[PDB]
Enzyme design. Structure first.
Site, PDB file in Angstrom:
ATOM      1  CD  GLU A 165       8.504  12.510 -33.959  1.00  0.00           C
ATOM      2  OE1 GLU A 165       9.650  12.204 -33.527  1.00  0.00           O
ATOM      3  OE2 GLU A 165       7.603  11.623 -34.052  1.00  0.00           O
ATOM      4  CD  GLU A 203       6.382  10.436 -37.499  1.00  0.00           C
ATOM      5  OE1 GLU A 203       6.827   9.597 -36.670  1.00  0.00           O
ATOM      6  OE2 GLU A 203       7.079  11.379 -37.915  1.00  0.00           O
TER       7      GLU A 203
HETATM    8  O1  LIG Z   1       9.466   8.365 -33.299  1.00  0.00           O
HETATM    9  C1  LIG Z   1      10.097   9.658 -32.838  1.00  0.00           C
HETATM   10  C2  LIG Z   1      10.834   9.483 -31.552  1.00  0.00           C
HETATM   11  O2  LIG Z   1      12.079  10.128 -31.713  1.00  0.00           O
HETATM   12  C3  LIG Z   1      13.025  10.183 -30.649  1.00  0.00           C
HETATM   13  O3  LIG Z   1      14.292   9.550 -31.106  1.00  0.00           O
HETATM   14  C4  LIG Z   1      15.239  10.299 -31.950  1.00  0.00           C
HETATM   15  C5  LIG Z   1      16.596  10.215 -31.299  1.00  0.00           C
HETATM   16  O4  LIG Z   1      16.440  10.508 -29.908  1.00  0.00           O
HETATM   17  C6  LIG Z   1      17.584  11.179 -31.937  1.00  0.00           C
HETATM   18  O5  LIG Z   1      18.876  10.868 -31.399  1.00  0.00           O
HETATM   19  C7  LIG Z   1      17.625  11.099 -33.479  1.00  0.00           C
HETATM   20  O6  LIG Z   1      18.996  11.015 -33.981  1.00  0.00           O
HETATM   21  O7  LIG Z   1      16.741  10.097 -34.054  1.00  0.00           O
HETATM   22  C8  LIG Z   1      15.483   9.761 -33.357  1.00  0.00           C
HETATM   23  C9  LIG Z   1      14.357  10.240 -34.216  1.00  0.00           C
HETATM   24  O8  LIG Z   1      13.177   9.517 -33.868  1.00  0.00           O
HETATM   25  C10 LIG Z   1      12.310   9.989 -29.239  1.00  0.00           C
HETATM   26  O9  LIG Z   1      13.141   9.221 -28.353  1.00  0.00           O
HETATM   27  C11 LIG Z   1      10.783   9.554 -29.100  1.00  0.00           C
HETATM   28  O10 LIG Z   1      10.032   9.976 -27.883  1.00  0.00           O
HETATM   29  C12 LIG Z   1      10.033   9.917 -30.355  1.00  0.00           C
HETATM   30  O11 LIG Z   1       8.911   9.032 -30.397  1.00  0.00           O
END
Ligand SMILES: OC[C@H]1O[C@H](O[C@H]2[C@H](O)[C@@H](O)[C@@H](O)O[C@@H]2CO)[C@H](O)[C@@H](O)[C@@H]1O
Ligand SMILES: OC[C@H]1O[C@H](O[C@H]2[C@H](O)[C@@H](O)[C@@H](O)O[C@@H]2CO)[C@H](O)[C@@H](O)[C@@H]1O
Length: 357
Positions: free
Chosen positions: A162, A281
């Site tokens: 991502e 995914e």
């Molecule tokens: O499904 C993937 C998703 O990921 C994002 O979220 C992150 C989060 O923001 C981070 O802080 C990290 O620690 O873990 C998560 C990993 O998914 C996004 O907010 C989203 O648009 C994207 O779908």
């Protein structure tokens, strides 16, 4: 090769019983490809899992003088060796855009930078990422004797889960980084497929707008990803896209059709470029006020009917242990997307589709 696949992120630090449960569940379900993480960056993240892969720059595996720790390469070796026995193919992702398991921000902390996107630009960071990927790709599996470079159980390398670059909405920084890194991996390993591992965002392509006017940022380049430009890179073999309408601002009554248009648009673009495409995914929250199984049916039907090459749900888990064990003894559903090899209508659907692809 068309397939139903899934994801699991803990195949490089959980026990043999837990890894065998995932891979046996995949085999029992007909799931042919599992996408897994091949990273554990930073000393805090390694210590939290007592498993080491890249705790500091130039340290690969467990630091000298640390005892009673797991080596994430050995756990990756066990997963590869079991997947090989059970006939599952693996896509291995090399760094995370997100901070889970360290990610790009861990590299930026090591090199004293000041923004996540310095990962793509700082030559000292890029060099460290190449040193890590060269150590991994050359690693000889301790259960098989076969270096990962030569291991056919590995279907593909992916550069970054991502990846985003919001500081360069032209999309150029990621294009240049992906060209450099995908060519670097082909220089190490001419045998395996290379893909990026991005979510598939577009960057204002004439005639492509989102369903319903929602989640426009996924279509208008906000994240710095120009999927079409990345797929056109000569050293990228197939396109990857992800799909989470519930994260992206789509309304629940539009999840199915937003996802449908997303899939159609990505297949159309990849067919014109002439490379395969994988929805690698996708997920709808278990609590969404819509029939999850029926959205998943619609999406897998569309990938199948339109000639996409694979559809992989996030995510498959197996039996749990210790502090990661739920009311039925499985690894818990922490994010609302977990599927296990049970009698749920999702699990039954995956079994049904794995017979068709
Ligand atoms: O499904 C993937 C998703 O990921 C994002 O979220 C992150 C989060 O923001 C981070 O802080 C990290 O620690 O873990 C998560 C990993 O998914 C996004 O907010 C989203 O648009 C994207 O779908
Ligand atoms: O001593 C043979 C073998 O025992 C263990 O292997 C397990 C394997 O991990 C399970 O997946 C399943 O195949 O049953 C086996 C034991 O019968 C050890 O993991 C291994 O190192 C060893 O060769």
């Amino acid at each position: 090769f068309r397939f139903i696949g899934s994801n699991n992120y803990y195949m490089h630090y959980k026990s043999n019983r837990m890894i065998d449960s995932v891979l046996e569940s995949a085999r029992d379900m007909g799931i042919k490809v599992l996408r897994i993480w091949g990273f554990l960056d930073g000393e805090s993240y390694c210590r939290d899992k007592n498993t080491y892969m890249h705790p500091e720059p130039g340290v690969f595996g467990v630091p000298e003088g640390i005892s009673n720790a797991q080596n994430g390469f050995e756990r990756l070796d066990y997963t590869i060796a079991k997947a090989k026995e059970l006939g599952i193919k693996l896509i291995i992702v090399l760094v995370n855009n997100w901070d889970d398991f360290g990610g790009m921000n861990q590299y930026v902390r090591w090199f004293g930078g000041t923004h996540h996107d310095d990962f793509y630009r700082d030559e000292r960071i890029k060099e460290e990422y190449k040193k890590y990927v060269s150590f991994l790709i050359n690693h000889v599996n301790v259960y098989t004797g076969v270096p990962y470079r030569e291991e056919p159980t590995i279907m593909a390398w992916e550069l970054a889960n991502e990846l985003r670059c919001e500081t360069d909405k032209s999309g150029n920084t990621l294009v240049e980084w992906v060209k450099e890194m995908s060519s670097y991996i082909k220089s190490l390993d001419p045998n395996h497929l290379v893909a990026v591992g991005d979510e598939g965002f577009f960057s204002n392509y004439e005639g492509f707008k989102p369903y319903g006017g929602e989640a426009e940022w996924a279509y208008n380049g906000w994240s710095g990803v120009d999927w079409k430009k990345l797929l056109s890179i000569e050293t990228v073999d197939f396109g990857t896209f992800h799909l989470y309408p519930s994260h992206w601002g789509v309304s629940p009554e539009n999840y199915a059709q937003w996802g449908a248009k997303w899939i159609e648009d990505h297949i159309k673009i990849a067919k014109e470029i002439g490379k395969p495409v994988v929805l690698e995914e996708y997920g709808i929250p278990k609590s969404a006020p819509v029939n999850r199984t029926a959205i998943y049916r619609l999406w897998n039907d569309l990938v199948y009917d339109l000639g996409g090459d694979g559809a992989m749900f996030w995510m498959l888990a197996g039996i749990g242990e210790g502090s990661d064990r739920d009311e039925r003894g499985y690894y818990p559903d922490y994010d609302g997307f977990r599927i296990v090899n049970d009698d749920s209508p999702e699990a039954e659907l995956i079994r049904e589709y794995a017979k068709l692809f």
